[PDB]
Amino acid sequence: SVSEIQLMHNLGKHLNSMERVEWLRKKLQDV
Numbered sequence: 011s012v013s014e015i016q017l018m019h020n021l022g023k024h025l026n027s028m029e030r031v032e033w034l035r036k037k038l039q040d041v
Contacts, residue, residue: 012020023030 018034022034025033
């Protein structure tokens with residue numbers, strides 16, 4: 011329960027290390 015920007019940041023790092031790097035750019039292209 012935060013802001014749309016902060017919500018993407020909260021779900022854009024847990025993955026592993028290199029997963030968040032590709033997830034913040036390839037998500038909008040392929041969800």
